[PDB]
Design an enzyme around this catalytic site. Structure first.
Site, short mmCIF file in Angstrom:
data_model
loop_
_atom_site.label_atom_id
_atom_site.label_comp_id
_atom_site.label_asym_id
_atom_site.label_seq_id
_atom_site.Cartn_x
_atom_site.Cartn_y
_atom_site.Cartn_z
CD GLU A 170 -2.98 -1.08 2.24
OE1 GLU A 170 -2.60 -1.76 3.22
OE2 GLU A 170 -4.34 -0.87 1.99
CB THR A 206 -1.06 4.51 -7.47
OG1 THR A 206 -2.07 3.70 -6.46
CG2 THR A 206 -1.99 5.76 -7.65
NE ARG A 226 -5.68 -2.83 -0.19
CZ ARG A 226 -5.64 -4.21 0.12
NH1 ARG A 226 -6.69 -4.70 -0.30
NH2 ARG A 226 -4.66 -4.42 1.18
CG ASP A 231 3.24 -2.88 -9.48
OD1 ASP A 231 3.80 -2.77 -8.16
OD2 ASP A 231 2.27 -2.85 -9.71
CD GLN A 274 -0.70 -7.05 2.15
OE1 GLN A 274 -1.15 -8.10 2.23
NE2 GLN A 274 -1.58 -6.10 2.55
#
Ligand SMILES: Nc1nc2c(ncn2[C@@H]2O[C@H](COP(=O)(O)OP(=O)(O)OP(O)(O)=S)[C@@H](O)[C@H]2O)c(=O)[nH]1
Ligand SMILES: [Mg+2]
Length: 316
Positions: free
Chosen positions: A11, A16, A146, A168, A172
């Site tokens: 996150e 993005t 998200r 990308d 996590q």
């Protein structure tokens, strides 16, 4: 060819940045592409209001108005549709009334005590727009979605006559073991840090401060001898959320010795120095640091322009 690799904790904003490359360098998301994100917007919206409603149970927060209890029941009865990409007027009304409830708001404002999507308010405040019949997600709606990244996403684009291959990966803990698959032939790493993470804990571990986790990862990547000749770009991201949060959430939660004020410039600079100081070879290895709001296309455009010129001067 230029291989760029995005790294950072979950996150932090990596995916993005990927979306922004399509918007800036490839004329953005088409209508069909936007429609694909409609169920994601609806899913994010439902999951966000539900997460706040779940938190009210945990924290023992009452609805401001008892009439919301029936709305909360209807929420779960009707939620299935939004998960399939449809939002009825009735569902929208239920969510809208819930979102405006003072108890729900009290819980919303305590979101650091649980796990809530950063875009929760963005979608919930725009319910009238997104609930419209024949609603089609805007570029910003797409940017705000998200979805946890699993595996490796590869995107191509042309900019200043260079052909970029941007990679990308998930940030996590469960996905970290996959980073090594991307380590070959990297021209530059863009390491993303969520500035607003300083007072949050990991979704995957509630004892670990999010920003401390980010620091550990940056320390590991920045000082890895494999990347000695790889340009290290540091995006201190979510500066928009950080600007708002620093007003009311003490930075000492993260950095006990912070002695500056609760203001953007001093706190941002302090966080920058904390990360840059992890560099064990300050005279031989440069870190190119930028403050970003990844959802803001204009900000990303100008920042990415500056980053690209650095990459051109140094690697090409
Ligand atoms: N307000 C605001 N939201 C942001 C910013 N950057 C990313 N977001 C939002 O935060 C959420 C997470 O961003 P995302 O791009 O998915 O992170 P990620 O690094 O790819 O996360 P992961 O795949 O490793 S789990 C998304 O909803 C995104 O729209 C920002 O600068 N400002
Ligand atoms: Mg991602």
């Amino acid at each position: 060819e230029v291989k760029l690799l995005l790294l950072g904790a979950g996150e932090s904003g990596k995916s993005t940045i990927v979306k922004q490359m399509k918007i800036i360098h490839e004329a953005g998301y088409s209508e069909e592409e936007c429609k694909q994100y409609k169920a994601v917007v609806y899913s994010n919206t439902i999951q966000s209001i539900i997460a706040i409603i779940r938190a009210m149970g945990r924290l023992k927060i009452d609805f401001g108005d008892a009439a919301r209890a029936d709305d909360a029941r209807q929420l779960f009865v009707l939620a299935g549709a939004a998960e399939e990409g449809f939002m009825t007027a009735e569902l929208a009304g239920v969510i809208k009334r819930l979102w405006k409830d003072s108890g729900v708001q009290a819980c919303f404002n305590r979101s650091r005590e649980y796990q809530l999507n950063d875009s929760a308010a963005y979608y919930l405040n725009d319910l009238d727009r997104i609930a419209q019949p024949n609603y089609i997600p805007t570029q910003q709606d797409v940017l705000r979605t998200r979805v946890k990244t699993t595996g490796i996403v590869e995107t191509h684009f042309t900019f200043k006559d260079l052909h970029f291959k941007m990679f990308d990966v998930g940030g996590q803990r469960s996905e970290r073991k996959k980073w090594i698959h991307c380590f070959e032939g990297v021209t530059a790493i863009i390491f993303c840090v969520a500035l607003s993470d300083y007072d949050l804990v990991l979704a995957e571990d509630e004892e670990m401060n999010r920003m401390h986790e980010s620091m550990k990862l940056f320390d590991s990547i920045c000082n890895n001898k494999w990347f000695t000749d790889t340009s290290i770009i540091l995006f201190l991201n979510k500066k928009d959320l950080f600007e708002e949060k620093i007003k009311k959430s003490p930075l000492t939660i993260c950095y006990p010795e912070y002695a500056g004020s609760n203001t953007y410039e001093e706190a941002a600079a302090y966080i920058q120095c904390q990360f840059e100081d992890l560099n064990k070879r300050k005279d031989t290895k440069e870190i190119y640091t930028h403050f970003t709001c990844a959802t803001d296309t204009k900000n990303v455009q100008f920042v990415y322009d500056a980053v690209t010129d650095v990459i051109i001067k140094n690697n090409l």
